[PDB]
Amino acid sequence: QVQLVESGGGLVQPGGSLRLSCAASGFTSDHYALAWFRQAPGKEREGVSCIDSDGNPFYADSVKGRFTGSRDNAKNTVYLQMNSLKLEDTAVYYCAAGLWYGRSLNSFDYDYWGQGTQVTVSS
Amino acid sequence: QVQLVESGGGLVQPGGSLRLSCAASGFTSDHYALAWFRQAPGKEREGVSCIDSDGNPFYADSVKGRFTGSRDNAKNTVYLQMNSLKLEDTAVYYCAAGLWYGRSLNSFDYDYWGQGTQVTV
Amino acid sequence: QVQLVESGGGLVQPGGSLRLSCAASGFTSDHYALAWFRQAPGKEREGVSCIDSDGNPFYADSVKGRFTGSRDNAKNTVYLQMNSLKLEDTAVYYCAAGLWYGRSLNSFDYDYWGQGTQVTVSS
Amino acid sequence: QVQLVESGGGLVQPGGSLRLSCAASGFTSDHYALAWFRQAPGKEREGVSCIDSDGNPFYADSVKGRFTGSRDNAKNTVYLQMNSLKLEDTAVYYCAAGLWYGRSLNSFDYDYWGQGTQVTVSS
Amino acid sequence: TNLCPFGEVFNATKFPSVYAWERKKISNCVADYSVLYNSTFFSTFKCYGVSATKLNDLCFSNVYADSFVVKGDDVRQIAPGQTGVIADYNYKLPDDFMGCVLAWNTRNIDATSTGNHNYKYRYLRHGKLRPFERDISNVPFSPDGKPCTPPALNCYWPLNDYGFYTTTGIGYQPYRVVVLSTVCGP
Amino acid sequence: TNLCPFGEVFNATKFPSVYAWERKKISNCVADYSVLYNSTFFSTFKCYGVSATKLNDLCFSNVYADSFVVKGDDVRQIAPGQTGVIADYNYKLPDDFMGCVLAWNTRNIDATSTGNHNYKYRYLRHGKLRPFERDISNVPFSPDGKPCTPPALNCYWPLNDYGFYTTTGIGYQPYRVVVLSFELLNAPATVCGP
Amino acid sequence: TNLCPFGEVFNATKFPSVYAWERKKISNCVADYSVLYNSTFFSTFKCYGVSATKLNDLCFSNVYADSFVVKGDDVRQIAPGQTGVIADYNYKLPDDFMGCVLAWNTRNIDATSTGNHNYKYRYLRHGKLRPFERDISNVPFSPDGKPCTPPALNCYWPLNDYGFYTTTGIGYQPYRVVVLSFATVCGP
Amino acid sequence: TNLCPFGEVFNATKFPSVYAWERKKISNCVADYSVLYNSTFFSTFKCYGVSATKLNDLCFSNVYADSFVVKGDDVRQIAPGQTGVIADYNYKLPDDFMGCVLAWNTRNIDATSTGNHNYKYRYLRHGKLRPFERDISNVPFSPDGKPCTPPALNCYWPLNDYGFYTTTGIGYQPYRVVVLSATVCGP
């Protein structure tokens, strides 16, 4: 069936950068959109960035200018570059795919969620 | 999901013997019944033999005393030994399972069908 | 869910005419094409006539020029006019729907089947 | 399909009593247990009471001695009498059944949820 | 040590249609289910939620036996979690069912060269059936619910006919089904 | 020449409940869908069967816009093939749908610390909805279908209320949805792109 | 202008098996699909996501035609969201597919009283197919993944054969399928 | 004569992760299930294919108890006909299962303000589990099947961790599950 596998998470220090990968497995459709979500303990799952099927990215206002995400056409992989990190960016990050043509920064529209790679920012 | 894989079919002459093997894949349950079906070209799919949910096997009256089939539960493979072959036993043989305790159907109203392995006499 | 209800079958004599009705109690969710099938005891279910979703009709080779079928645009009712009847047209007639834009006169493309109204042309 | 319909909720005053009913319409099983759940704004829906498959009911410790629930054999309606109300009992109450021939006071086990009947305790 | 009246239902000359299915109450007897599966009289003998071998070691208050007749392609609908016209409108089994299903071909006694249409089934109803619900009404069905004249628009009869000939394949042939739900084993 | 009156629908001060959703017909204007997809005003912008980018190079006869309001967890039901109370009884989309869905959070205007229960949705009906069917009746539901008034037994009201507070997550928060439908069969087309 | 060479694909004498399906690229022509829908050559002509009447007023860069042959009971698997041995392992269509499916019975040309087993399909693979994925390998399948030659235990061949006689019904009869997927191919 | 050692599994100090679930065989004892359903220690007590009240009137050869730990939203996956990562890859029950499921919240012992990530579950495997099948291998998963160690391309570790804090809802809170499947009789 469908499988999403996040990778690239780890312990980092403030001011640094990170790259996260997640791969799509069982997609019988063609132009599905892909997005990045983060979930802190005891908080609501925030929409970080969402790249449509056509490759265009959309970011939340809290990470604009700080985060950069993109997709690979050949490989079923979504990437998210996380520059200028902070300590509030500590969260469990998820990739999710949605079966439409546009964008959605909302957690409730996807139907297919990943497993979640932990990102920690300490000192 | 579930998959059934037949093996053992081939060309023989009358009076000979053959053994057919079939392996089951999707184990979403534990007490599955397993059976053997054959269908000649342009004919209705006949029930050959039906092996209980790990119990006793049952054969159709047309092949009683001639065929013997049974399965191993640990290996989840059904075997069917076909002694004393004839020319009317020529058919495409199918493996089928079904999710019903103890004895089960001889009719074709099963849930999971295998793949036609040809047996020619 | 989806339901199809046939009506109009009865005993008639050769040379006559008959009209059969079928109602689509199912969802308009799709652009379904609707078709007519008949089956006699001990024979394979023949595709009699198929009217596409776009309004175009298609008939089987055996009844061309003799049969006329059509749908109701406002409602979800398909009609079948059978002119110049014979005794070989005796069969149990079925209504069937299929969820595509085109047309087919094959039994295996019809995911949704109606009931059986008997038509006899004996005496 | 399956349907649960709550009724009987309304504004009451402390110390009073209330009766809530909920009836099950479509059930292809025979031995389902029935329970009552409540949820306040910004809180998780707590298990209030859970009535066995046609047998004995079970209450959460927070309402023991104050609440009483029961089922109807002829009908498919469970009642919950709420005696000696307090101000913390204000919540939107839900009935849930689930198909497991047993009982549980957790929200994640209940395959089928009802609707929101509001219960308010003010002055 | 009284015996259960089994043969009175199986060797019965007359069987009802599915919509008017009949139930024979079994009480005050010792049911030996072991001897039945050892008989080739049934082509279909499937037990749900229990093995027939272990039934010989169980007691019950009363046992219910639902007798009716359907064609082959409609025998698979007599099963838990199964949908279809026979299950939706004629005979619904619960998904948590615990019993056995019995069937066997009866082309020789319920099929004629002209077509035996005495066996009917319901294909229209206002809502599906609960488990073991029995709707033997014969009122002309209407979507609006308002009683109408049967040859009128949007007005249909609720029952349709099985055509059981001798020329049809085993998929269209009549099978006689018996469903099994102080009464102990030996 | 003239521009399509979109902001009248998006900057509209008042939105109806879901069961009583309203539709505005768009005709005789130039719709620039590129600016909409490029705008962050909508948090959810899902297009089915077509990309919004190519709408800028397409003509249509008339465009229809269905405006309504549901909570977060129920926006997922505004989609083809989706089941649930909102899709069954309030707003059903056809499986062969070709268009776009727009939504955005409005807790600032539709949530209060006391609770805004003015927004209602239907949870009972005799049969599910056809595509684009609209039932604004408020007759007490009954299992037998026979009309009953008495709030005494086996007779229930068809509408239920959304409780929109400020403390609940975005799953319970009000989102204002605008669904876009199209039409071309009319031989002369009026709603074109640039 | 130039006309599209359709008869080269439909009146073709040779058709491949499903697992070894072939795709013909069509370019630089005006396709009038209206004449096709009005023809009885195809018994099955199903279009998904588009109406055949309006295709005549549309342009395309290149048009692709996948030709192959399966039996009746397996024609239903050439559809979005459809599963099964042919759809899982031989030819998978996307749920968002947009094109047309064409088929017609060929018992007169692909069936013999002795049995035509020349047509093969795949029934074993390690994982299902992507949309438009094509596995024409013929390596002996193994569950454990370890490559094996001997066909005795736990090692099976991946392809199986259709037996097409004349005595079987149209559920078992061979049909010849042409699937069409999607600025040189325009209307008039 | 002797009674079944139930408290040894319930009063157990340590519980394993789900993928490494453990089973204790019960034999030659009289199990009094009446005290169990009547006890409020369990928030979830689900019996499938049978009611627990009638277990007191049955004998059995041996009774098996699978002990493990998962979060709330994943307790419903311990059930017939249920799919999902816990059911596909860690613990699958047969659809014809006949037994009981027991669970209860343990935020008091398995949640910390720092996060108790000692509990892991499998999220990648080559093929799903048979009923009662147990894959405790910890070899790095690969799509091609060819074994790789490194955290390089298309090579991932097979186990993932539950994050148990004190602020999370009961959907993310740890629950301790015990599944129960002629020597073990009733009273």
Short mmCIF file of C-alpha atoms in Angstrom, two decimals, chain A:
data_model
loop_
_atom_site.label_atom_id
_atom_site.label_comp_id
_atom_site.label_asym_id
_atom_site.label_seq_id
_atom_site.Cartn_x
_atom_site.Cartn_y
_atom_site.Cartn_z
CA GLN A 1 0.00 0.00 0.00
CA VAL A 2 0.99 3.61 0.63
CA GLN A 3 4.07 4.29 2.74
CA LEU A 4 5.74 7.54 3.78
CA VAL A 5 9.16 7.44 5.45
CA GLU A 6 10.74 10.59 6.89
CA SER A 7 14.50 10.89 7.29
CA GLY A 8 17.13 13.45 8.22
CA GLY A 9 16.05 14.35 11.75
CA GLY A 10 18.46 14.68 14.63
CA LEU A 11 19.78 16.80 17.47
CA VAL A 12 20.99 20.24 16.34
CA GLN A 13 22.07 23.53 17.93
CA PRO A 14 20.58 27.00 17.27
CA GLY A 15 21.50 28.96 14.14
CA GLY A 16 22.25 25.84 12.07
CA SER A 17 20.60 24.19 9.08
CA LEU A 18 18.93 20.86 8.34
CA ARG A 19 17.63 18.89 5.35
CA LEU A 20 14.75 16.42 5.71
CA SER A 21 13.75 13.73 3.23
CA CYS A 22 10.59 11.66 2.95
CA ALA A 23 9.80 9.07 0.25
CA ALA A 24 6.46 8.04 -1.28
CA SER A 25 5.75 4.34 -1.90
CA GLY A 26 2.26 3.24 -2.82
CA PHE A 27 0.74 6.05 -4.89
CA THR A 28 -1.55 4.77 -7.62
CA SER A 29 -2.38 8.36 -8.53
CA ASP A 30 -0.15 10.72 -10.52
CA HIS A 31 -0.23 14.39 -9.39
CA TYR A 32 -0.57 14.26 -5.59
CA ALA A 33 0.63 17.25 -3.52
CA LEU A 34 3.19 16.91 -0.71
CA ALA A 35 3.63 18.90 2.51
CA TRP A 36 5.56 19.16 5.78
CA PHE A 37 3.92 19.31 9.24
CA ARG A 38 5.33 19.60 12.76
CA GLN A 39 3.84 18.55 16.09
CA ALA A 40 5.16 19.63 19.50
CA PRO A 41 4.16 17.68 22.65
CA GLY A 42 0.71 18.79 23.76
CA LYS A 43 0.20 21.14 20.80
CA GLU A 44 -1.77 21.17 17.55
CA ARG A 45 -0.02 19.89 14.42
CA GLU A 46 1.25 22.97 12.58
CA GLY A 47 1.44 23.26 8.82
CA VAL A 48 5.07 24.02 7.95
CA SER A 49 5.23 23.93 4.16
CA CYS A 50 3.17 22.49 1.32
CA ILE A 51 4.45 21.92 -2.23
CA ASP A 52 1.73 21.27 -4.80
CA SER A 53 1.86 18.60 -7.49
CA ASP A 54 3.20 21.17 -9.98
CA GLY A 55 6.25 21.78 -7.77
CA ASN A 56 5.28 25.16 -6.35
CA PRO A 57 6.02 25.59 -2.62
CA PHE A 58 3.95 27.29 0.09
CA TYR A 59 5.25 28.03 3.58
CA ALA A 60 3.70 29.11 6.85
CA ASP A 61 4.35 32.71 7.90
CA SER A 62 6.38 31.57 10.92
CA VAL A 63 9.06 29.96 8.72
CA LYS A 64 8.98 32.21 5.64
CA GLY A 65 12.52 33.22 4.71
CA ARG A 66 13.85 30.58 7.14
CA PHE A 67 12.62 27.31 5.58
CA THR A 68 12.90 26.03 2.00
CA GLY A 69 11.16 22.91 0.74
CA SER A 70 10.99 21.22 -2.66
CA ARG A 71 10.10 17.97 -4.42
CA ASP A 72 11.91 15.60 -6.76
CA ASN A 73 10.05 14.71 -9.94
CA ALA A 74 12.02 11.56 -10.78
CA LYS A 75 12.19 10.20 -7.23
CA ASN A 76 9.16 10.15 -4.95
CA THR A 77 11.03 12.33 -2.42
CA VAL A 78 10.10 15.62 -0.70
CA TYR A 79 12.86 17.76 0.79
CA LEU A 80 12.72 20.56 3.38
CA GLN A 81 15.75 22.76 4.08
CA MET A 82 15.53 24.31 7.56
CA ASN A 83 17.79 27.37 7.88
CA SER A 84 18.20 29.74 10.86
CA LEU A 85 16.89 27.29 13.45
CA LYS A 86 15.54 28.25 16.88
CA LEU A 87 14.67 26.38 20.06
CA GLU A 88 10.90 26.71 19.48
CA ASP A 89 11.34 24.74 16.21
CA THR A 90 11.89 21.60 18.31
CA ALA A 91 9.06 19.27 17.22
CA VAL A 92 8.31 15.90 15.63
CA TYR A 93 8.12 16.60 11.90
CA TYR A 94 5.75 14.77 9.56
CA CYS A 95 5.33 14.53 5.79
CA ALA A 96 1.80 14.10 4.43
CA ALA A 97 0.42 13.63 0.93
CA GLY A 98 -2.92 14.77 -0.43
CA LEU A 99 -4.83 13.65 -3.47
CA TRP A 100 -5.65 16.95 -5.21
CA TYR A 101 -4.04 19.52 -7.53
CA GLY A 102 -3.51 22.55 -5.25
CA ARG A 103 -2.14 23.40 -1.80
CA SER A 104 -3.31 22.88 1.77
CA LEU A 105 -1.57 24.07 4.93
CA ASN A 106 -4.23 22.25 7.02
CA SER A 107 -3.70 18.94 8.79
CA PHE A 108 -7.23 17.68 8.23
CA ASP A 109 -7.11 17.45 4.40
CA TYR A 110 -4.50 14.79 3.71
CA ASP A 111 -5.63 11.16 4.45
CA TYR A 112 -2.02 9.86 4.25
CA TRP A 113 0.44 10.70 7.04
CA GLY A 114 4.05 9.76 7.64
CA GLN A 115 5.66 8.31 10.73
CA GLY A 116 7.60 11.29 12.08
CA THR A 117 11.30 12.00 12.51
CA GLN A 118 12.25 13.88 15.67
CA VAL A 119 14.03 17.23 15.46
CA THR A 120 15.59 18.53 18.68
CA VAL A 121 17.30 21.89 19.24
CA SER A 122 19.49 22.01 22.38
CA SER A 123 22.69 23.67 23.61
#
